[PDB]
Amino acid sequence: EGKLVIWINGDKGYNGLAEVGKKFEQDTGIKVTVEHPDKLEEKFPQVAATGDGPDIIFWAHDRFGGYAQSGLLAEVTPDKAFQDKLYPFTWDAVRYNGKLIAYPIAVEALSLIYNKDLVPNPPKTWEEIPALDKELKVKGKSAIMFNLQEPYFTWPLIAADGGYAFKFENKYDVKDVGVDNAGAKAGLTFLIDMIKNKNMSADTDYSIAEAAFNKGETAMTINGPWAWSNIDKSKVNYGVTLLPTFKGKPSKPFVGVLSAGINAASPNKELAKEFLENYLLTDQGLEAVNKDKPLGAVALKSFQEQLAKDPRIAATMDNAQKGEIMPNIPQMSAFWYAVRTAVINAASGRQTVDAALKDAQSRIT
Ligand SMILES: OC[C@H]1O[C@H](O[C@H]2[C@H](O)[C@@H](O)[C@@H](O[C@H]3[C@H](O)[C@@H](O)[C@@H](O[C@H]4[C@H](O)[C@@H](O)[C@@H](O)O[C@@H]4CO)O[C@@H]3CO)O[C@@H]2CO)[C@H](O)[C@@H](O)[C@@H]1O
Ligand SMILES: [Mg+2]
Ligand SMILES: [Mg+2]
Ligand SMILES: [Mg+2]
């Protein structure tokens, strides 16, 4: 009691958040400690269920319905004046069983990131990437590298031709899952065909793809706004644009709302409200985080007006509008775990595309 402990993922601007915390302490005398534990999103329900953990947890909104279902989150209590400061759809992302259970911070979607000096006119279709890779390979380069270990990054291609997570009835139907339909299989088959053709490697992860793109070894990558800061520091002149189409249809990235939840076991709920409402969710607070690692589009209207001019933010929102907001329902984690296994198994040859996605479908339903 009398201090704030915050958990936020290691790819976000946690040093910039810590600067917001130091301003909070200067004004209130209350120490703010920012940590970025690994697997924090799995650790939180295990320690919050024993009355331990951080006061505030940051994650995309898809994790928070499971937390709320287990009673681990405090209902947030912003007045109507504060609610009108943020975009209504961001509040929708953090509403569960009619109650607001987090503060929305930022809106994230994946984009195509490309090296302007290797591919001045980036490809508009996935289907043209193998021919581009062939020309780059004679120069000792590759067309594209992105994280193949996390299903977040492969989902936009799987969804393009018809894959989906849970069908929404304008409630989600947890038994109507689109992981093993013909569109999902077509997109995962194309990924596997690029791997078989040695346009990509099944073992490429986040670090490998980031290093290759930022050193100028691959012409393109797929990542979110948090990655731009490291590219700014690199020698690479990059642009951010629409994901390629597949079979003429847009890639459909899942849209995540970075959100801050207050632990139901926190003895500091009033302090957490003060910090999130009056320090973080201000133009100056978001700027401090954004200058560390870019947040993407932000939930705070006044600051989003200042970011909307950036072509990288414009591309982020264009991809977001072609994609889908993630469900926040507890079943979303089962979806992600099952799809992760399916993609890794198909990409590594441990299963066929059909057998992998059928098994995921059975697991989820
Ligand atoms: O044992 C397998 C892995 O299990 C753990 O990872 C899980 C997560 O616990 C799940 O929540 C889920 O992860 C989703 C995530 O919830 C979702 O928001 C999105 O994550 C993006 C994030 O929004 C974005 O801001 C940025 O940080 O990139 C993330 C993606 O890397 O998508 C995730 C799914 O890819 O599913 C994974 C399993 O895939 C555990 O943390 C791992 O250590 C473990 O490998
Ligand atoms: Mg983690
Ligand atoms: Mg509640
Ligand atoms: Mg792995």
From TrEMBL:
<dbReference type="Pfam" id="PF01547">
    <property type="entry name" value="SBP_bac_1"/>
</dbReference>
<dbReference type="GO" id="GO:0030288">
    <property type="term" value="C:outer membrane-bounded periplasmic space"/>
</dbReference>
<keyword id="KW-0762">Sugar transport</keyword>
<dbReference type="GO" id="GO:0055052">
    <property type="term" value="C:ATP-binding cassette (ABC) transporter complex, substrate-binding subunit-containing"/>
</dbReference>
<comment type="function">
    <text>Part of the ABC transporter complex MalEFGK involved in maltose/maltodextrin import. Binds maltose and higher maltodextrins.</text>
</comment>
<dbReference type="GO" id="GO:0015144">
    <property type="term" value="F:carbohydrate transmembrane transporter activity"/>
</dbReference>
<keyword id="KW-0574">Periplasm</keyword>
<keyword id="KW-0732">Signal</keyword>
<dbReference type="GO" id="GO:0042956">
    <property type="term" value="P:maltodextrin transmembrane transport"/>
</dbReference>
<dbReference type="InterPro" id="IPR006060">
    <property type="entry name" value="Maltose/Cyclodextrin-bd"/>
</dbReference>
<protein>
    <recommendedName>
        <fullName>Maltodextrin-binding protein</fullName>
    </recommendedName>
</protein>
<comment type="similarity">
    <text>Belongs to the bacterial solute-binding protein 1 family.</text>
</comment>
<dbReference type="InterPro" id="IPR006061">
    <property type="entry name" value="SBP_1_CS"/>
</dbReference>
<keyword id="KW-0813">Transport</keyword>
<dbReference type="GO" id="GO:0015768">
    <property type="term" value="P:maltose transport"/>
</dbReference>
<dbReference type="GO" id="GO:1901982">
    <property type="term" value="F:maltose binding"/>
</dbReference>
<dbReference type="InterPro" id="IPR006059">
    <property type="entry name" value="SBP"/>
</dbReference>
